[PDB]
């Protein structure tokens, strides 16, 4: 069959929200502290902090996210932030160079660059393999933003209070996605299942990042290089 | 008469400490977030945060500062930091341009630049007049570092516990300074009194900065642009 008017509206809301909160020019990157080849921590902390602001604004056009309590919104953002960032970064990832190409050579981040920001191959290896698998799925823009909104409105996050409601919005987004794939995506007959498994990958990426971030945020000579937003969001402040 | 061996040692310790913690090349400035013409807040926050690290290291070669309790050291640094920074910045201030010239044109800060970092002429006017008066005093390098060490080891700071001891080290530094002026500074017969009055100026500059910083640190869209070190040091965390 076809998609309802309500699902078309949700799709249009989501991609407009992604378009407003993601700059294909990457021109704001000149305002981060410049990269140096833990030499990359200042630049990459700025990059993530900037990305967190974007993710907050994207969240902010998700239909129904705002109508949740401010505590639920904070819970959802704090535990899903790094996953949305990992997800959205696939738009700059390129299989030809196996890295993220945002500007010229200064703003291209390969594995060795992230190494010099306090992270090991235990995170980098699954992360790059995640970007590779997700890029080969060749998602439509609608599926990409749908996946990000589904990932963020997960009710199985610590701290969420109104599970019922969040799971409800997450379910309606899953049905829009599942329907958009079966109608407008040729040969997507197993795609949705694979996307749902990408979410599970993000959970394992999340936990190893949360571990590695802890060890660096617990050393003041390193956590002094982070930003207030990063510390607030990635800290266990509760 | 002449200066004792002990006072020569103190002088040499102080200027070596200043030389190690102050870079006339200003070449680390490329690693701050770049200035933009509250557009200057990110660059100037980075500049101050970097300067705080330097001031800590300078403090760290002051003979006797380390032998104080770690709480006294924190008390002394938290309330004197912005004053030492105002003082040390006179080395880049130039009367010919009425601003601080550190790099090329990007790293020259005139009054309008600081305006766009959340500060009013109520602070900027006395600050620039302070830099002007202090630069026309044409201090020797020894007097400049002596003045900074005296300013930091002031026992009339909130939070200090061992007044006796800090006032003692402050007194010995004042007598070294007073003696160096009368022996090695031609026509300095009123200079020391004027330097002591510069300290009083710093107190009034300190308080108006503390007020203006409060109003900006209380707006999260602005305090998110500060650094962890700046927030820790300039906050009333106690």
């Amino acid at each position: 069959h076809m998609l309802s008017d309500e699902q078309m509206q949700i799709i249009n809301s989501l991609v407009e929200a992604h378009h407003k909160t993601y700059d294909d020019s990457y021109s704001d990157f000149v305002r981060f502290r410049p990269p140096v080849r833990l030499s990359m921590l200042p630049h990459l902390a700025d990059l993530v902090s900037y990305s967190i602001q974007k993710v907050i604004g994207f969240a902010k056009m998700i239909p129904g996210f705002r109508d949740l309590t401010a505590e639920d919104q904070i819970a959802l953002l704090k535990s899903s932030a790094i996953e949305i960032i990992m997800l959205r970064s696939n738009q700059s990832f390129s299989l030809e160079d196996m890295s993220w190409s945002c500007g010229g050579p200064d703003f291209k981040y390969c594995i060795n660059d992230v190494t010099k920001a306090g992270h090991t191959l235990e995170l980098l290896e699954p992360l790059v393999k995640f970007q590779v698998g997700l890029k080969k799925l060749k998602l439509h823009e609608e599926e990409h933003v749908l996946l990000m909104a589904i990932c963020l409105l997960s009710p199985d996050r610590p701290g969420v209070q109104d599970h019922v409601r969040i799971e409800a919005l997450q379910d309606r987004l899953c049905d829009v996605l599942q329907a958009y794939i079966r109608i407008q995506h040729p040969g997507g007959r197993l795609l949705y299942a694979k996307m749902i498994q990408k979410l599970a990958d993000l959970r394992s990426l999340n936990e190893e990042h949360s571990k590695q971030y802890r060890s660096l945020s617990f050393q003041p000579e390193h956590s002094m290089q982070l930003t207030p937003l990063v510390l607030e969001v990635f800290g266990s402040e509760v | 008469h002449m200066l004792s061996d002990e006072q020569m040692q103190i002088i040499n310790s102080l200027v070596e400490a200043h030389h190690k913690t102050y870079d006339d090349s200003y070449s680390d400035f490329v690693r701050f977030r770049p200035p933009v013409r509250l557009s200057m807040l990110p660059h100037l926050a980075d500049l101050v945060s970097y300067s705080i690290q330097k001031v800590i290291g300078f403090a760290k070669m002051i003979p006797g500062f380390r032998d104080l309790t770690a709480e006294d050291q924190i008390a002394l640094l938290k309330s004197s930091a912005i004053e030492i920074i105002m003082l040390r910045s006179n080395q880049s201030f130039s009367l010919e341009d009425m601003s601080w010239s550190c790099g090329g044109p990007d790293f020259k800060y005139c009054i309008n630049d600081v305006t766009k970092a959340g500060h009013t002429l109520e602070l900027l006017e006395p600050l620039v007049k302070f830099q002007v008066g202090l630069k026309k005093l044409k201090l020797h390098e020894e007097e400049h570092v002596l003045l900074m060490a005296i300013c930091l080891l002031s026992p009339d700071r909130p939070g200090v516990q061992d007044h006796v001891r800090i006032e003692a080290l402050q007194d010995r530094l004042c007598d070294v300074l007073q003696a160096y002026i009368r022996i090695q500074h031609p026509g300095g017969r009123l200079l020391y009194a004027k330097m002591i009055q510069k300290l009083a100026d710093l107190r009034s500059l300190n308080e108006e900065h503390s007020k203006q910083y409060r109003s900006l640190s209380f707006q999260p869209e602005h305090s998110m642009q500060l650094t962890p070190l700046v927030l820790e040091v300039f906050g009333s965390e106690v």
Partner: peptide
């Protein structure tokens, strides 16, 4: 708690 997050979610 979460001074900046609150701020960025309002407006």
């Amino acid at each position: 708690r979460h001074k900046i997050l609150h701020r960025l979610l309002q407006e």
